[PDB]
Amino acid sequence: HVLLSPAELAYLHASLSLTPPIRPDGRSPTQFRPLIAETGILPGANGSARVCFADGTEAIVGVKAEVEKTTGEASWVEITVEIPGVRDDDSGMVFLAQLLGEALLADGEFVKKLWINRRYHWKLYIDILLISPPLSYPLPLLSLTTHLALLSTRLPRLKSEGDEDPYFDDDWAVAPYLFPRTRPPITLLVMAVGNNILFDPSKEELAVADVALAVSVTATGRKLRLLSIRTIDPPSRLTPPGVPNSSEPIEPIEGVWRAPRGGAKRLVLGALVQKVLEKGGVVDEVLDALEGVEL
Amino acid sequence: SSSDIVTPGELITTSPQFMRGHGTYIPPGTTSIISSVAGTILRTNKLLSVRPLRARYTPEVGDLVVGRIIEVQARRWRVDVGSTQFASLPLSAINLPGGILRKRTETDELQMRSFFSEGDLLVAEVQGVYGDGGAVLHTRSLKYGKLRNGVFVAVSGMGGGGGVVRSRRQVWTLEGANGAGLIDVVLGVNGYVWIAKHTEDGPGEDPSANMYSSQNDRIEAETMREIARLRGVVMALVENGLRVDEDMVMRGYREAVEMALVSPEGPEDVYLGGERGRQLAAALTA
Amino acid sequence: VRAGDTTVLCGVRGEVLPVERIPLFRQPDVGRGELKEYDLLVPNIELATGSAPQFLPGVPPTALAQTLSTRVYSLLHSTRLVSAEELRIWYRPVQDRVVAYWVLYIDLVFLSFDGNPFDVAWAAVVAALRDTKLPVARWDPDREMVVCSKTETMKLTIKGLPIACSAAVFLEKKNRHWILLDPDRLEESLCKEVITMVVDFSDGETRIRAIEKQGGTVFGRELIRSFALVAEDRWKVVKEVMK
Amino acid sequence: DRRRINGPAGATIPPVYEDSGISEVKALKIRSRPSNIIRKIYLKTGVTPSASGSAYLELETSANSGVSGLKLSCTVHGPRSLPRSSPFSPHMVVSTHVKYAPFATKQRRGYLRDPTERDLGIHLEAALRGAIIADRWPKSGVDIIISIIEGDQDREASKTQGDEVWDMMNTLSGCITVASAALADAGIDCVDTVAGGVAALVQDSDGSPEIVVDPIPSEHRKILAACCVAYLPMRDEVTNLWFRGDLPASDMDLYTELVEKGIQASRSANRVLVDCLTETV
Amino acid sequence: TTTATTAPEAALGVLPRADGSARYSHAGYTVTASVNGPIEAQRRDEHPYEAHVDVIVRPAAGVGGTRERHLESILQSSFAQIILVKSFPRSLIQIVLQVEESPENEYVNTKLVQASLNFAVMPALFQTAMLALLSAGVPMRATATATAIALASENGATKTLIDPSPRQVELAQSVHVFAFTSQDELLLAESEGDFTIKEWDAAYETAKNIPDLRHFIRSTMEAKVATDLHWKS
Amino acid sequence: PREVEPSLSERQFVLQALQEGLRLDGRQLDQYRPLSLTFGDQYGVADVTFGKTRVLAKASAEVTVPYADRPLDGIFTIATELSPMTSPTFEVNRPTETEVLLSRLLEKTIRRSGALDTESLCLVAGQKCWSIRVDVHVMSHDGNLVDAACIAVVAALRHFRKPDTSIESGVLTIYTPAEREPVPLSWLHTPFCVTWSFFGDEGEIAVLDATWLEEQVRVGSCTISMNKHGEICQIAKLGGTPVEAVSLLQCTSIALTKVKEFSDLVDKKLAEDFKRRNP
Amino acid sequence: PTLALPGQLLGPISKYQPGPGTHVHESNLYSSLLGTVHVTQPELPTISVSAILPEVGNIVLCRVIRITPRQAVVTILVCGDTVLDAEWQGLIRVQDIRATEKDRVKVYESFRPGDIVRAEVISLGDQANYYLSTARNELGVILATSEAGNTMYPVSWREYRDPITGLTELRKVAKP
Amino acid sequence: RVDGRRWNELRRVHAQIRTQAAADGSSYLEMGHTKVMCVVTGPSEPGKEAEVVVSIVIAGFSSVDRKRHGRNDKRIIEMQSTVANALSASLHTHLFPHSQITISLHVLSQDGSLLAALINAATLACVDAGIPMTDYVVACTAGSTSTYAANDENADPLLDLNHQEEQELPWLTVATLGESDKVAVLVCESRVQVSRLEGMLAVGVDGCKQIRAILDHVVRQKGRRMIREG
């Protein structure tokens, strides 16, 4: 997806390989980039949110809740991911669409919320638009927008009982929140180079990742609950090889890039998820920043 | 004559005294010149042209640009320079280590990927521009060639509008701070910027078969910190619309270095985003 | 069904089609017949990607899958292999009605393709249909839907045993021609002319249910008459496999 | 479609059972297999000689002889020239195509290809690409095609069994194992054999939950979480980790154990994989 | 035009833009065929030795399903045996056949997606394609003519129906399609239904020794050439 | 493959001739090619020829279960897949910009014109509805397919006859032609397409029926669909060089005249065919 | 005769030198293939595994599929007497056909589609093609079939002759 | 009279430019409750003239009913063709023969006049992107208050119709390069009498003039603030 030169990649890998990871941004490994977001961006949508990164990418999510004829729980919710310029069937788009759905349907509590009555259920439509061209891996931003959107989602209050077809007050200000203030799941693209664990990686950083995980978490530091982990195929594997100065290389030559040839060391996987779930960690930082957005 | 912004379809002048220029067009049935873009009317030697508010890089002969190669074609590379179309780099326009000496030139045409491959970065000079606007690059000067030992960042006036501009020189070497040592900077007029440790084969100047090998020389941590610091500085300028130029970068770098020294996090911290980034700009615009 | 390297897996999955969902449906007297009017048989051939080099994902698609599907479909109907009488689902209260039809989705997948696909494919279809054991289904007037027993199954009354035999002509072009039975993938690439012969011998007299010669002129009336004997021999040997 | 013999115009209904007796349904399946023992893997190599390398994998549904469940056919296609629309790639391009057999499709007539088929491709692609040496064969591509002949549970029935995700993890574990067998058969430079292990945290009673290797959701009253792992025992590396389930961060130990047993399942599966490959040559 | 007329009726150059074309109608079936002379083959089918022959069949109504895909293969294989494909190694030859009319089966409601082989239409398609190839001037080893025989059985006797209507085909005990080259060799022999080899051979005779399509092809082609070579004098 | 282009000599000359008010075909700028409309022996077959442009179109009705866009509604569809017979440039199963617009303009014309009584089509609600499919076959493409196709489509649909049906004791009986005489498809008003083309660099030259060669030279076009009574069923000047609104109003004003004679022809031609069926 | 599995440890890099079918990892040498181990034992002993790609300098046999006045495009079938399970396109540029008078030689006079050429790989090429040179006595056409379709024989280095039709044809004969 | 609006009266048209920093050109456009956001790639290499590629994304939430839109894939492909041809009628594509211009349009909300909004949003982005244009390709809708069946001579054409009006009344979309009468796009899918057409076109053209004043004003307000600072 992303394109970089081997010599450019070799510098990035070496810099992040140092004991204190010297990220190209100068950012701390625990530190996210600045976040700009909006809620209720689209009127007439039960929940909507916009998010734009310092990277320039932006995404908009809108939530439509429609009463449908069915404590009861079924995967009524459907997620759509509109990426500009894709064939509507690409690997990345469908993988993301399933991944975000996996997070919400992971506990199944979320399905329960959308249960108007035993006879009728709220079929929830989540439409995710990547406003910007896919300059970098959208997953982090899309997840944060979905988190913000669901938080902003309000559900029509039910004047009618359940056995009769449901009837709802019409005031959006009367309608109570979905996920009223468990939280909607956040998901962090976590990356590893050597023993260093990196969060919110830039496309340049992610291009040299030895390991990349999409970790979905929620809260009820905060009382975190792990929901899913998926291994993002390190884009580093698809990069060109480095050419040493004047066949199988016997030695890891300094400054010569070489795609990570194996899998993730077993311990690193524990380290990547351990650091995600540590109390007061990145998840708390993300939720603190996210929950500070007006709703 | 930039009193106010002229807009597309807006009549600039009707008199025939003027030749048209970029950003303007003449309806075939009249002498009138009409602006094609939203921009400022520029008048020189009775030629009228409109500089657009924002437009992609348009190359001029002699421009020193940084671009990454996107394609390999018959005796040619297509180089992305942020222009309207990929710049061309003829195989004859690069400094082969011994293209004449090897007598391998017939072999060379087939093995172009030994010199540059898709994604490889280079610093080159525009030796010509076609009528369609595509530039033709040349890399025969020893300071031109594949870029190594550095980091790449793209500037396109994101948010701040202002970006890279033509200057006295587009390449310089800074001593660096915290014993980083000589580190080069390349301000590609096309908006691409390259920051790397200085080397004798590098583009910079201290204040051949391996030339195309993608092996970085060893780089120490402090060197990478400063290289990262400069990259943060450049983004700080762009994110606040400041002129990105060697003079304004050195000012920012020194300000950033001293900012880190007085910062409680110590000279080691290199972060410059957000409010701290604006703080640098405020101290830099003064 | 394995025939050398060629390997076909046929799966017959029956699904119930309510008559209220069938355009052109009429209560039978007990048209093209129910099988064709209602499309009760739905054979589809999957030349599974990578089953042979010619079916690699990057190689342009070819019509072979479609042609075999219709070849099977027409032969499946013309042979009258399955009778609509078996696929009817009756109410028969205690005013009889047909409430739905069993729809046989006869899916084939070429796990390995080493030439001569139709012979293997047809054999799999016949073998699978003979094996088919649909669940006994009945109309539930209280639930107003067709329901099926969890244990009782009714087997299809497959009539006859049409066995497909195929061969290809290899030409030295005295224009010597060699008739190659069961052409291997490689042999098909070299033999432009192919013949397919579907015969049924359950009557003890060969009955040709279908012939498909094409791609050349070597196979005159004499060879085709001779080939009918070859197909009968092929029927005899295959009969001993599809017990 | 133009390319397939369309069934009847009406939407056909899958068989719905009479369900005459609730009593007949009686007891719920209980995992007799020890918590640390995988299903019996049947693995064969060279099943499609036309391909450069191939393998076939089959599992007993509930460790019962003759009761076959998952069935996977894999045909690696050997490094082959890349299409000319994208004629160059510095690294060998591993391309994974996974398709449910029409017999195994969720819908006998389907408007849309299962998202599940695309998803399994990405997981398997990530798992195998880590285990395959791309540097060896530049300018070339290798295509791993998985045909899911049969799922451990019927697709339309799986909808009733809590969640298909658990089945997908079982399917992915098989895909990793069989694909590795095919890759070894095809002689594709691989860093190590990769086998697909899967483990689950389950709670079949009011007592504390157990960690169970190679689960099947029907055998358990509640799967709290599960993990699928493409693991390289000779490297002690994981090329594709997949986990799902609500686990409190306080239960980080359980997750760690869950992954470890999932890796243990991968080792167990790899044992069969090496045995099959050893006897193949 | 209609089924009752014994005489085949044909035209050539029906479609002007096409390299060659022909509109042929017989026994109630009308098909209009356009042939494009060797042209740029899409790299997919650029055989190194011989021209690729690409037969395309379009039904009168509905989209071309699997049925047509078979007809295209049947005609593609046979015509590749007729055309001198070796003469245009890398070229392509388009043969688009458009079924303009077939006898409407009054006893069945319209079904467009039917996927069964339609032997009924094979002769009309083959003849029209043959005429179009002759019109296009594509080099060929020999001409070829196709005939359809339906072996209906009535009472205790078997009845040969020549060029039957599709209604006759579905009522027929068996149906046969023979395509004999000008050398009297057999080119296609597609058949279906229950029949003994004796019955097939009997039909082979009926289709081969009989409207004299060989003469019809020659006569119509003579008229066309005589018309446009009238200048020669 | 990509469409073949005329040589710049042809491009310049055609533009030059139009500026002289002359066309290579000898027709005036506001003149159509000789229009021939032929009806096939089977009901619903119509064969329109605009000089060298021939468009065969066959209507068909099959009772089908209603789902999706018309879940209980009864649905009329148009299929106009172009084929190499149209031109080698076209490829099977490969829609093109020409085909997509052609289909789009036809379906909008027939549907938005309200010509068909869709409520009449549904034999049963949500179970069985008549589906009226009309297949358009472009036998020869010499420009103005959108116009030739429209006449063929409406001619076919007006010529087409449904199988008769009857509801008895709630039982829907659909009668084959042998059982009952097919009933003509009810048809309120007949829309007709007219496709102007514009050539001047300012779009000041308007041509009524473009040859294929002209269509390669034109800088814009504007399809107009109208009833005999002047009701415009659609207008589609989908971009191209702009044209003064007065010109378009002139184009529509002329188009109504051409539509009237098209309507008279189809009515006359249907009457002539009717006598062949019933002398 | 020792069978090795993918990822099986072969030994430390200090004892062996990685050969085909092996890969290094943390200063240790492992087998990347399922196959038998072999040690060259020539410096350190090279170790390899045997269960293929064209390479510069290799002699390949290929089939001509299309010819252009500039280059003839061939399909590579055999590399070093080893048939290739998958095929690669190669280009024989007109310069690369003959050792001398490279300006005078024409592709039409050297090879034509369908014949089999034995060529030497000159370079891994840009895009999808290799670059092969037949400019050597041992290189050129091996199997040729006349326009008439008969299998020809090399009458002289310049031309093949037909045994049935008798006609000669100009082609780049391989001398042996 | 129309609810809360005059017959010859646009709805509140509010637009923004340089809405997204990443895009070479970006625009946001609101026409009443119809919201369209557009991001235009600057001409860049992806032959006689630059290709203009338009991708329209209609969000499910933007539609009042998910079922109503029903994917509408044919509709979207037609709209992309309309807009692409519309913009190319003005963009000086001949200046970038070997490049492509990509316009991405996101329909965040629909309240009728969608095609007009899409064209307007595209031009704003194209002007933002600095693409040389002959003139604003402004678009607007207009539809007779009387139905074609009603045939009321007294009735006069409306402007900037709401979605409800588009269901009830004959309506048209006219896009005119510049303030000029000449029309780049004239899409009138609804049935209308020819007598009514002249009035609707005349009103529609005037609407385009009003929209252009808004659009040009929006461009200058951004332009002035830029020259004021760089």
Residue numbers in the entry:
A (entry chain E): 8 to 77, 114 to 224, 241 to 279, 308 to 333, 364 to 412
B (entry chain H): 57 to 263, 280 to 358
C (entry chain C): 73 to 102, 112 to 175, 200 to 278, 288 to 357
D (entry chain F): 3 to 283
E (entry chain D): 3 to 212, 236 to 258
F (entry chain A): 2 to 280
G (entry chain I): 6 to 47, 68 to 76, 95 to 219
H (entry chain B): 14 to 59, 87 to 270
Question: What do the study authors state?
Answer:
In the cytoplasm, the exosome is involved in the canonical turnover of mRNA and in mRNA quality control; in the nucleus the complex degrades and processes a wide variety of RNA substrates. The exosome is a modular molecular machine that consists of an inert, nonameric core (Exo9; 300 kDa).
We determined the structure of Exo9 from the eukaryotic thermophile C. thermophilum (ctExo9) by X-ray crystallography to 3.8 Å resolution and by cryo-EM to 3.2 Å resolution. The general architecture of ctExo9 is identical to that of yeast and human exosome complexes. Despite this wealth of structural information, several disordered regions are invisible in these structures. In particular, an extended loop region in Rrp42 (Rrp42-EL) and the entry loop in Rrp41 are largely unresolved, while the shorter exit loop of Rrp41 is only partially visible. To initiate the MD simulations of the open state, all missing loops of the here obtained cryo-EM structure were modeled using the ColabFold implementation of AlphaFold2. The global analysis of dynamics and PRE data revealed that in Exo9 the invisible Rrp42-EL adopts the closed (open) conformation to 5 ± 1% (95 ± 1%) and that the open to closed transition takes place at a rate (kex=kopen→closed+kclosed→open) of 5800 ± 1400 s-1. The order parameter (S2) of the open conformation (~ 0.1) is significantly lower than of the closed conformation (~ 0.7), revealing that the loop in the open state is highly flexible, whereas it is stably fixed to the rest of the exosome complex in the closed state. Rrp42 in C. thermophilum thus contains a previously unidentified flexible one-way-plug that readily allows for passage of substrate RNA via the through-channel route but that prevents access to the Rrp44 active site via an aberrant direct path.
